[PDB]
């Protein structure tokens, strides 16, 4: 009766004219005939249509269009990784998938605390630039006569060449989805604060600390991950020294608090002191 | 044991699924063999199913 859609994939307009093509397509996952919806998110947009069944949509809490999760807008991998949940059991076969469907007809995503991981790795404002014309394939080959009139983007494709071959079923299930792979390697580096070649440096530098955070407040921060050798304030730099007694505790404190944690609101950075 | 196992298991599971879609409903005996085999494979999600 209404698509299950990412609210980015409805564009800025509070009013939406959308075309409703009942039996307009086959679900890109369950291969099922379903009701397609087509619309132009905004004036700079193209016409996007739903890509999957409504059920196959609301199973994995993903948009019918972008196949991204509905709460955070990250691919189904990145959300399944932060959800920590098992690999997809759902049958890849379509005899299997339709059998699972016809079963579930005749007779876990809404009750989770907001994962900081997903929240940390998500876009603040909407990726409206995802609702925009493809790139003019005749502009690429240099043979576009349509001039600036082309409804297609007059730019060249600037994309990872292992990407641009993404599979629907794999972006919906979560297997070898190169975009979420790139994203998790990003978070792998950001979760990779370099523990230096010096093994004995047992201090962590805490920079960017706004003044209302006190030294015992950052002590309340860092006591959990190991014994503190000494904590040292200097508000002139808005920064702090924290030395521990064991290296692995400062390793813990880097690994958990490297991806920019916020102590009582202050966006603070960690470095190996 | 690796990926030679897995494909023997594919072969015997396709054998079981074929036998079961043929003979499964009308004459008992078969699901016991299928389920004891999946128990031999120590696959209990499959054997419970």
């Amino acid at each position: 009766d209404m698509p299950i859609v990412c609210e980015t994939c409805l564009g800025p307009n509070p009013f939406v004219r959308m075309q409703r093509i009942e039996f307009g397509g086959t679900c890109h996952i369950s291969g099922r005939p379903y009701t397609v919806f087509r619309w132009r998110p905004g004036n700079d947009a193209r016409y996007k249509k739903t890509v999957i069944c409504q059920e196959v949509a609301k199973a994995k809490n993903v948009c019918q269009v972008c196949l991204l999760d509905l709460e955070y807008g990250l691919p189904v991998q990145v959300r399944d990784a932060a959800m920590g949940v098992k690999p997809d059991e759902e049958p890849q076969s379509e005899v299997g998938k339709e059998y699972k469907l016809q079963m579930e007809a005749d007779a876990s995503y809404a009750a989770g605390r907001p994962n900081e991981m997903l929240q940390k790795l998500q876009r603040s404002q909407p990726y409206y630039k995802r609702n925009q014309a493809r790139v003019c394939s005749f502009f690429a080959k240099g043979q576009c006569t349509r001039g600036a009139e082309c409804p297609y983007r007059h730019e060249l494709p600037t994309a990872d060449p292992a990407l641009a071959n993404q599979s629907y079923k794999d972006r919906y299930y979560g297997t070898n989805d190169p975009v979420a792979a790139k994203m998790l390697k990003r978070v792998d580096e950001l979760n990779k604060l370099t523990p230096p070649e010096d093994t004995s440096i047992t201090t962590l530098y805490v920079g960017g600390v706004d003044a209302s955070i006190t030294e015992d407040d950052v002590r309340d921060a860092f006591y959990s991950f190991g014994e503190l050798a000494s904590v040292r304030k200097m508000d002139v730099k808005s920064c702090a020294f924290v030395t521990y007694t064991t290296r692995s505790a400062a390793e813990k404190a880097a690994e958990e608090l490297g991806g920019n944690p916020l102590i009582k609101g202050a966006r603070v950075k960690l470095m190996w002191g | 044991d690796p990926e030679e196992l897995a494909e023997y298991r594919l072969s015997k599971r396709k054998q079981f699924e074929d036998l079961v879609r043929r003979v499964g409903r009308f004459n008992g005996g078969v699901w016991v063999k299928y389920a004891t085999w999946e128990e031999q494979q120590k696959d209990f999600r499959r054997a419970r199913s």
């Binding site: 039996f23 005939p33 | 409903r25 009308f26 004459n27």
Partner: protein
């Protein structure tokens, strides 16, 4: 040994035997054992 069980867009194949026919029902009138007529008598 075991019969087929017969559980139940729509397909657009139209049979010849499924074309409209006998499209209204006959009901029992007064004089053909209609139910209100038959309460009236001692059978």
């Amino acid at each position: 040994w075991a019969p087929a069980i017969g559980g139940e867009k729509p397909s657009v194949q139209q049979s010849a035997k499924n074309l409209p026919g006998h499209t209204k029902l006959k009901f029992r009138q007064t004089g053909q054992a209609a139910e209100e007529e038959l309460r009236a008598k001692d059978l």
